[PDB]
Amino acid sequence: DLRLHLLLNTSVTCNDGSPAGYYLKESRGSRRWLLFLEGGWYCFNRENCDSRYDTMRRLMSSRDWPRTRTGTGILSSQPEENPYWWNANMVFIPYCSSDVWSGASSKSEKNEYAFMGALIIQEVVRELLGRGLSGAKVLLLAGSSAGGTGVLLNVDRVAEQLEKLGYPAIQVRGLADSGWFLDNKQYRPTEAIRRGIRYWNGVVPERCRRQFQEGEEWNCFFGYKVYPTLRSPVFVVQWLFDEAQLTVDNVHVQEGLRLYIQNLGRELRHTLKDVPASFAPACLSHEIIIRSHWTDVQVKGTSLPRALHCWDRSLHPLKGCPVHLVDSCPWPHCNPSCPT
Numbered sequence: 001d002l003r004l005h006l007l008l009n010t011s012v013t014c015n016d017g018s019p020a021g022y023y024l025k026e027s028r029g030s031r032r033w034l035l036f037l038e039g040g041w042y043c044f045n046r047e048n049c050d051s052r053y054d055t056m057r058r059l060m061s062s063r064d065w066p067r068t069r070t071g072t073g074i075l076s077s078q079p080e081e082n083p084y085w086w087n088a089n090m091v092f093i094p095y096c097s098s099d100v101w102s103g104a105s106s107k108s109e110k111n112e113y114a115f116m117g118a119l120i121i122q123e124v125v126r127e128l129l130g131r132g133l134s135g136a137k138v139l140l141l142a143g144s145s146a147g148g149t150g151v152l153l154n155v156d157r158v159a160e161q162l163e164k165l166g167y168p169a170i171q172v173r174g175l176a177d178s179g180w181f182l183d184n185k186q187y188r189p190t191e192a193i194r195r196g197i198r199y200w201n202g203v204v205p206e207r208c209r210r211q212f213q214e215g216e217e218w219n220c221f222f223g224y225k226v227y228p229t230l231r232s233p234v235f236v237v238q239w240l241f242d243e244a245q246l247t248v249d250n251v252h253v254q255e256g257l258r259l260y261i262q263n264l265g266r267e268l269r270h271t272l273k274d275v276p277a278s279f280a281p282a283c284l285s286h287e288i289i290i291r292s293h294w295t296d297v298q299v300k301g302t303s304l305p306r307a308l309h310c311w312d313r314s315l316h317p318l319k320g321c322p323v324h325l326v327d328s329c330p331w332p333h334c335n336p337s338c339p340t
């Protein structure tokens with residue numbers, strides 16, 4: 001069980017002005033810290049956000065959050081469930097800003113909602129330093145789906161924050177799960193993100209912003225465009241046939257659709273060729289790192305917990321302990337270890 005703490009700075013808020021927060025389970029024998037960003041789509045205008053407030057309110061408000069949460073997958077403290085980091089300090093940061101973790105806008109007489117995702121991450125880090133994060137040797141910022149994209153948008157800002165506060169010894173790293181999308185043509189999207197960025201006052205990493213320039217910041221939401229600009233080490237986990245990617249592509253089998261699906265897997269593989277820490281199985285699925293059975297899937301005979309352990313060793317190629325693992329077979333579930 002991870003225990004809830006509402007932010008002491010009550011001006012850093014969820015969408016409806018209630019305080020944001022985090023769930024924590026400390027491990028005082030460990031100098032490793034895992035901060036996980038929840039996912040859950042987003043909203044991009046007044047009418048769409050009002051609908052989300054009616055039926056997805058826990059993603060917009062802390063008023064109904066429970067006092068505890070069970071850690072699962074990479075957040076589990078049991079070695080059998082989490083071979084990688086079972087002894088780490090565990091943090092789950094609820095997603096209550098509806099802005100893919102990019103926003104920096106308060107509620108006001110001109111704004112019905114607050115979009116503060118980027119500031120929530122910064123404030124959680126600041127308040128954790130008093131609870132033991134000051135002694136860390138590794139801070140791993142992880143996340144799934146919208147939270148995976150949030151890792152790519154925020155990992156370098158956390159590194160800069162800790163350096164400027166005077167903690168140069170904490171190594172900041174990222175783990176992005178199911179947050180690596182393609183801006184491809186549909187079988188039968190980017191405009192919603194463009195409108196969202198303006199609605200949220202959304203912010204993107206500085207080097208990527210300088211490349212694409214004013215009005216084109218939406219480009220930095222796409223992994224293959226923002227990843228080369230990042231300085232912190234980032235491990236990318238991405239199913240080749242991700243269900244959210246197919247949903248946005250309007251895919252729900254004849255020759256035209258067969259070619260479309262094969263092309264999607266080929267393009268995704270291409271974008272990961274120069275990503276040296278990555279795990280990309282040929283499966284139709286969505287998210288992995290906080291699922292209890294995340295230990296089951298393998299690429300070339302290597303599980304995800306093993307690949308992550310090999311990554312840790314590389315940050316001290318390694319015989320028998322690979323870090324770049326991308327399937328080459330071209331159809332969903334051509335890998336026999338895919339979830340069923």
Ligand SMILES: C[C@H]1CCCCN1C(=O)N1CCOCC1
Pocket residue numbers: 040041042100145146147149181182183189190192193221244248
């Ligand atoms: C999965 C969601 C939430 C997080 C960012 C990526 N997401 C999108 O819905 N997108 C991205 C751009 O292309 C299609 C629209």
Ligand SMILES: *[C@@H]1O[C@H](CO)[C@@H](O)[C@H](O)[C@H]1NC(C)=O
Pocket residue numbers: 009011012119
């Ligand atoms: C609380 O957060 C807001 C927004 O980041 C910031 O302007 C303010 O300085 C913070 N308060 C304190 C005491 O740090």
